[PDB]
Design a protein around this ligand. Structure first.
Ligand SMILES: N=C(N)NCCCN(CCCN)C[C@H]1O[C@@H](n2cnc3c(N)ncnc32)[C@H](O)[C@@H]1O
Ligand SMILES: N=C(N)NCCCN(CCCN)C[C@H]1O[C@@H](n2cnc3c(N)ncnc32)[C@H](O)[C@@H]1O
Lengths: 342, 342
């Protein structure tokens, strides 16, 4: 299928084992901002669901299908590839909704649905929006979407901004400097110090932070899910030009994302911005191995390039320069191995 | 090979990616008890190494091979299956030991050595000793051992003992009772509560604890690595008869382990007991779904059965009874998915 061709079986097994756990479902359901905002988006746009046919891509426990049902959907096909499908089935029976929610086990790329659908709902966002490459499954699912069908969420905005955080930088550097030792119990480790630094700075940092560390207005890159095709996400090129508002060392870029549910009645935003209440997505920071000095009024320009890999993640390349000085930094991050710092 | 026949490729990929990170090597090197005790065992038994041929099974960064070298080994074959082999090679060159340490990339079950060896060294111990099933690779490697060759470590003792820990026990129901809600954003989740309890009780708990929670002297199960065969570890049957020293509820069994390096000059012990300084192995606790009441002087008897699975771990079955009352408890745990509670 399209899923097995873009995915190592090793990555798929680990991925679906992980989403098989009820503890993991619970962790996500307890994020009140996530769950409450999805509910608000669907219920305040009840006319986008009333008497409609719905597809839920990756329904997990089924929670979004239940929200579609509360909003009056006639029929909801809830597709789920993990063993969580069986738990979803139990809840559909115990909430007396077997007439309206139909769980269909398997990958959305491999199953057959009996009907085209009016609206697709999902939670395909990973860290930094794109991690897990579940957005591809969500877009693939448009093959079941009626002409002029909607998607919830409808659009995703990635935000990037340069930051300064000396303590974060030093934490990671200090960990790599373990490999400087010329005599660790009598053994010289120092030839691996370079590789150790590479490895630590390759890890994106998932945590929150105070917005004061941001040194310029964010740049926005928008994916419109109504119009994008799965192959658009194999290679994502994000040019950026920051107008520096504060002088200081730039230790890297911070990422967060918003999605909008663009309904008939109203548009509801789910934000993971550091100005907004915290979600289980936190925010994400990619450190530069060598920080760049910049003055207020300078321009920091470059490119964030995401290349999809077969481990359901992305190789991240960030090249940035201070235009006024020609000072450049180049970085490769492996979004599959983030450092969870909270 | 013997390795690929007992192992899902999905488990092997995850396993070797994990040991490929220098951060993970560093975590193990920084465990002072681990590293210092291996060094003491090898250096204080210099006659087991001086001018000898050595095999290092799963050398990682190469640290144990360097210790063999400091003790006078003529030749050390250092076998490693992860991408860590390349980093080990760099360290052998930077420490000017290419004449003495030969790194051989690949599984010890698949590679070729040019000669038989006088002694095998390794750190095959996982959680509860047996997790990761690397003891099998260690024993398999005896095919390269000269008649009357040694092994470091020489023997491994698993210890089990009943414990009481009311707070730990209760934490499981507290977590699962998230599902005992008739209207979570309008959805009745209560049908999944039993399955959530099942899932948490299947997880062994990896953390440390105060020795006062132990309710009887440990029982010991010993593997002699000079004499054991690979197949002896596929099914491990540990009968137990505890003579209760304290009255209370028994919430489960605690596990820890010791290994001994039995050299020509001295025997050195590496212990992970809760009476001893803490290591990165901690200790492990398996809860019973139903606790058993026992009085001081009663006998709690039964069996701990470890059955090897293809995810490089074990299914753990524990059946226990208080002989004086006939009250019984039976429990199945998945050692692959431990709960890290520290
Ligand atoms: N990063 C955080 N925190 N959350 C990201 C959202 C996690 N999301 C939970 C959604 C519950 N509302 C993943 C679920 O979608 C399922 N799934 C994935 N890919 C497929 C596929 N190709 N076909 C069918 N199902 C798939 C997965 O098994 C899991 O149940
Ligand atoms: N902290 C816990 N819990 N355990 C410690 C793990 C000990 N150890 C670190 C070594 C430093 N002395 C594991 C290494 O052995 C390697 N490895 C495993 N199995 C094989 C095999 N069948 N053939 C070849 N190499 C193998 C693995 O790649 C890894 O580097």
């Amino acid at each position: 299928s399209v899923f097995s061709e873009r995915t190592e079986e090793s990555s798929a097994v680990q991925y679906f084992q992980f989403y098989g756990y009820l503890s993991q479902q619970q962790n996500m359901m307890q994020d009140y901002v996530r769950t409450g905002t999805y509910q608000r988006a669907i219920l305040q746009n009840h006319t986008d669901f009333k008497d409609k046919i719905v597809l839920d891509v990756g329904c997990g426990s089924g929670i979004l299908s239940f929200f579609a049902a509360q909003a009056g959907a006639r029929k909801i096909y809830a597709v789920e590839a993990s063993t969580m499908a069986q738990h979803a089935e139990v809840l559909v029976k115990s909430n007396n909704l077997t007439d309206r929610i139909v769980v269909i086990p398997g990958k959305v790329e491999e199953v057959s649905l009996p009907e085209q659908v009016d609206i697709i709902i999902s939670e395909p966002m990973g860290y930094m929006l794109f991690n897990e490459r579940m957005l591809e499954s969500y877009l693939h699912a448009k093959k079941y979407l009626k002409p002029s069908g909607n998607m919830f969420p409808t659009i995703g905005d990635v935000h990037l901004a340069p930051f300064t955080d000396e303590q974060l930088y030093m934490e990671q550097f200090t960990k790599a400097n373990f490999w400087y030792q010329p005599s660790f119990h009598g053994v010289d480790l120092s030839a691996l110090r370079g590789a150790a630094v590479d490895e630590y700075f390759r890890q994106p940092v998932v945590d929150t932070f105070d917005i004061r560390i941001l040194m310029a207005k964010s740049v926005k890159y928008t994916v419109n899910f109504l119009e994008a095709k799965e192959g658009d996400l194999h290679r994502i090129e994000i040019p950026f030009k920051f107008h520096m508002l504060h002088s200081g060392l730039v230790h890297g870029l911070a990422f967060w994302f918003d999605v909008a549910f663009i309904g008939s009645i109203m548009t509801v935003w789910l934000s993971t911005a550091p100005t907004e209440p915290l979600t289980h997505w936190y925010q994400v920071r990619c450190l530069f191995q060598s920080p760049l000095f910049a003055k207020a009024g300078d321009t920091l320009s470059g490119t964030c390039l995401l290349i999809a890999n077969k481990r359901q993640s992305y190789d991240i390349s960030i090249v940035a320069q201070v235009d006024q000085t020609g000072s450049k930094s180049s970085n490769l991050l492996d979004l599959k191995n983030p450092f969870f710092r909270y």
